Amino acid sequence: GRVRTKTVKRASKALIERYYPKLTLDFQTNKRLCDEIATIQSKRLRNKIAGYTTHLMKRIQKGPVRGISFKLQEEERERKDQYVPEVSALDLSRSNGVLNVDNQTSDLVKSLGLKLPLSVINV
Amino acid sequence: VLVQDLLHPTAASEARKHKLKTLVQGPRSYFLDVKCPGCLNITTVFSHAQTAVTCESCSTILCTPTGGKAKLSEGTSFRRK
């Protein structure tokens, strides 16, 4: 029965997605971070919240875990998105390996297409 | 579908549609002006025979009757219509 409720597990997620820096894998510091940054009512609520931020910070440092993407990790996802390192090859302009077409797609491009160097195979 | 024009239908469909279930009732059977392996004649036979038809000189069995289109006698030449 040491299950944390939504009232701490949401506050924790809001806290980490805002102050990912100024949070250091240690309850004893994270406790005092919550003292300064948050206006938590009870001393025991703080201890539970801070104890779960620390649990999230330990888990986030073994590779990003789903549900909590912070303002830094979003920029990492933006770079892996835009700067996709699959741009050395053309690619898909595979003049070396489009041209392994079969007799049906041959008759297809013959009917409608202009003209293509076509490497015809069968079955 | 919704728009077809079944007055001018495509032959890729009319070929497959049943003998009756076409634009007009028309048979898919035909006649073979088939020539004897022995005494050369021009004996007209039918696609779906129903009889073991023979040549004129001897009883040289040109076809064997089957469920659909009839068989031929090991060696012979055929000509449709």
């Binding site: 996709v84 690619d91 390996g97 489009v98 079969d102 797609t105 409608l112 202009l114 | -």
Partner: protein, 206 residues
């Protein structure tokens, strides 16, 4: 009529049949069915590339007709079109629903995920049936990237493609983004195929 320069260029035709948009196409088929080019032996179909391209130009004309850019909603809940619609949205401002669709998006005007499209672009009608079904309640046209055996229900202008390789989905999305950006946009020439690598649309595996 069209000015008749958009006539399936050989660089686009070789892109499409290198992506294998037609070299699969589901052996078992739905009886619509005019986007067929004599199914190959060994149990596979082959689609008319001319037709899918013509349909793509028609689709572009409808998307380009939509006056405000981000009333076109680019949806792809399947993994193989996620970044494809994200890039489509970023290029031609077209708010994407890449991920879970959160039903009650077009109906249910209260929810924070409330969009009122005048067009939907759906990568798959089967796996994104919720988007189509919800569009039917609020009078929204839908442009689908269908296969041959994909369902046609509550779906106008369908672009016949392939939905097995991912190369197709990535390409046909790039090409639609390309053709819309030409008509009343920053692509000032129809020729010179605007070679921004069609691999900014390919779902890069982890």
């Amino acid at each position: 009529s069209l000015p008749a320069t958009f006539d399936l260029t050989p660089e686009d035709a070789q892109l499409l049949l290198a992506a294998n948009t037609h070299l699969g196409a589901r052996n078992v088929q739905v009886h619509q069915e005019p986007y067929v080019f004599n199914a190959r032996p060994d149990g596979v179909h082959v689609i008319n590339v001319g037709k899918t391209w013509e349909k793509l130009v028609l689709a572009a004309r409808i998307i380009a007709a939509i006056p405000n850019p981000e009333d076109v909603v680019a949806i792809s809940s399947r993994t193989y079109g996620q970044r494809a619609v994200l890039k489509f949205a970023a290029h031609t401002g077209a708010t994407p629903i890449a991920g879970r669709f959160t039903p009650g998006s077009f109906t249910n005007y209260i929810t924070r995920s409330f969009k009122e499209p005048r067009l939907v672009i759906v990568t798959d009608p089967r796996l994104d049936a919720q988007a189509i079904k919800e569009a039917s309640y609020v009078n929204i046209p839908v442009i689908a990237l269908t296969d041959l055996d994909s369902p046609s229900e509550f779906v106008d202008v369908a672009i016949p493609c392939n939905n097995r390789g991912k190369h197709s989905i990535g390409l046909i999305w790039y090409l639609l983004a390309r053709e819309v950006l030409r008509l009343r946009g920053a692509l000032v020439d129809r020729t010179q195929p605007w070679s921004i690598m069609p691999d900014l649309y390919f779902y890069r595996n982890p």
